[PDB]
């Protein structure tokens, strides 16, 4: 079943797998990856978004990022699994 | 003339072009693009970024975003050409 997203899972999957392969096709460290993506996203929001709300969306983007970056399952699953 | 962000600029530009090319290829709107990139970056940080510095990278990246996205240009010349 759909994880939680109500947009289009398969569509996002196709895009993510593609974009990831594009980067992996050259292979760059996370440091450089953040460099590329940083300039990309910044310029994207700077141009593809109205100059008035481009800053506001950056704010919510940051919030969404912080709300999406989960380390691990905080609920320690009582799941019996030995190595 | 060269650029200050010449840190793998050759590959950064080419990779960024390809990433944008893929988006334009699939005809993915900004809304969907941000959704994919958001999940992508989050997964990248979750996997390749050490849990010790997951928030360190997250906050510094956010600060960089809100640093780069500001008022439109700090120096405006007269420029003898309107339209």
From Swiss-Prot, chains A, B:
The record ties this protein, via InterPro entries, to: UPF0352, YejL_sf
Q: Which GO terms describe its cellular component?
A: cytosol
Could you tell me the superkingdom of the organism this chain comes from?
A: Bacteria
Question: What protein am I looking at?
Answer: UPF0352 protein YejL
State the family it belongs to: Belongs to the UPF0352 family.
Q: Which NCBIfam families match?
A: PRK13689.1 (NF010242)
Q: Identify the coding gene.
A: yejL
């Amino acid at each position: 079943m759909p994880q939680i997203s109500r947009y289009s899972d398969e569509q996002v999957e196709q895009l993510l797998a593609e974009l990831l392969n594009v980067l992996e096709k050259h292979k760059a460290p996370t440091d450089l990856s953040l460099m590329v993506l940083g300039n990309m996203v910044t310029n994207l929001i700077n141009t593809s978004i109205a100059p008035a709300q481009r800053q506001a969306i950056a704010n919510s983007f940051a919030r969404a990022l912080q709300s999406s970056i989960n380390e691990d399952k905080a609920h320690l699953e009582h799941h019996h699994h030995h190595h």
